[PDB]
Amino acid sequence: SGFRKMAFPSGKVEGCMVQVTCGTTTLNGLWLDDVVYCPRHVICTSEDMLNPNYEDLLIRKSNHNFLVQAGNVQLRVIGHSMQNCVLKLKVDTANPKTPKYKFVRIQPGQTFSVLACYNGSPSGVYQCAMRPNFTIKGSFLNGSCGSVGFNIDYDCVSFCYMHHMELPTGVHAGTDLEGNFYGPFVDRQTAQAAGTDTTITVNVLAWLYAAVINGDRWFLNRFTTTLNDFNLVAMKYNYEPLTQDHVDILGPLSAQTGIAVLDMCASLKELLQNGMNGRTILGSALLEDEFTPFDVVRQCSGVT
Amino acid sequence: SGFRKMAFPSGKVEGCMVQVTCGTTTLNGLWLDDVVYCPRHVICTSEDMLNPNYEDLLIRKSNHNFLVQAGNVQLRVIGHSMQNCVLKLKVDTANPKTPKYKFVRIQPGQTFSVLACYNGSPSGVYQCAMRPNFTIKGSFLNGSCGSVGFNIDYDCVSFCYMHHMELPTGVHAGTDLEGNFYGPFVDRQTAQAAGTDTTITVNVLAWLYAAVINGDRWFLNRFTTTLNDFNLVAMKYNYEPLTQDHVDILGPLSAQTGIAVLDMCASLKELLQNGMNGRTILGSALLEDEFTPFDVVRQCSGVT
């Protein structure tokens, strides 16, 4: 028993982190096979970030200008190319620690682990979610760019995020490993404001099921609702609309606990309208939305 | 910017996890050098746990009864001994992945990362604190015993916890790596109730400093207090008494932010008396106490 905000074990990803320096800029790179992936803004100075022309800045860089270091040993760069907002640096040595991997582009509401790194060295690991406005709320200082987000399925690492930007509001933006930004964000230091950060309803419901499984049941009530009625309340509270697809995804948790999805929606509706009244659920005083239904099943069943 | 509940990168610890089976019981072991450490209750059945005589149960076990498996390869057990509540299984092969390590016994209020494992396989990593009542609030299912807690200082892993028990209330109890339980708990399935789970005041203050550094400042007020006055309010709210040692420990955060420790105590006192009023601090609706002052400095400076 007990339910924690849990990240995936980071070892497989630690074995892929390298330091990339170009000019005066140092950030992190991800070394998979004989390619090192990193944000293309490694070629910029802070002044260039105001209005960068990446193709033009890149023409002035040669393979020998990209310094790639794995631990205390230097990697030889034999090619470089720009793919969307990432650079792919071809090196002469395959990473011997390359795990089985995939590149996946996640949807908003999906969770992943981030291995925060500086100078190609891991500092920590935390769990987060792709917000509905395509930002993430991470912990990233100068030099953390190129740190990655991932999920693991037994022995295959699915990389889904690479850190690029901190918006003027302190939230974060980045790309998938094909270099396409999540949402409308760009790798330029300009006015980029995020949209409404709505709450991921399906994740809140999954977490309420985790609370019932792990003993916290005070919020269960004598009511039910419909998807349409629940969604009127969800709209009012800046929650994402709940769909029949989300109800189907919650089916296994509903079956395990014997609490119908719409009855849990009615508990959630009352929590939204009445508040917590100074009470807590799984050690939280707010409705937690950074656990997917899959995360709840995985943690409650101990998948390794 | 941004502040997250961050665990240490777990790779160095993943390389030490093994599966230990004795009879019908399987749990995790920690393989460092040529010794595998695991809870001595691996020798018990669930029925034995009601009233175990560990010395007597152990007499019936030989080296060949402890099955130790690292990945898919078996380790040969050439000796076994009981040290307090842990078994030390001497194996014929040193763990080639043994990191630099120490065994440390932490104090209440200190934080650490846990690598939750099942069948010697890592499932996830999370950050937690040793509560003032010597319990931890983890996420542990059947088979997670032997999972460990640790801190890392550059390349040296300090192991501080090994999971043993879940109390009837759903909180967790365990030992240091010398096999001594934290607090009054025992490895017997009996009535063991935890004391008051007070809030770690010094950690709440550190987290309020992290909030100011990372932009959340609404709770700062025009007041100050004294240690004695603050402690009267701390007593009322089941917070640990704040000492001059804690004030000294918060000195670097006070210097960085320019907010005197006693002024932050006055902000905390008002938060205790008035509540949050539906507001949040670093994404939390409660006062977070599982970040030490050292954690706040480490995360805010990007130590790798």
Ligand SMILES: Cc1ccncc1NC(=O)Cc1ccc2nc[nH]c2c1
């Ligand atoms: C500063 C920071 C902190 C956390 N996360 C991201 C960042 N960086 C940015 O937002 C853009 C940036 C800023 C200066 C750069 N110089 C070369 N490349 C650069 C990219």
Ligand SMILES: Cc1ccncc1NC(=O)Cc1ccc2nc[nH]c2c1
């Ligand atoms: C069940 C559990 C879940 C999470 N954390 C710990 C536990 N186990 C216990 O509290 C004691 C126990 C219970 C049966 C045992 N059989 C052999 N050894 C045993 C030890």
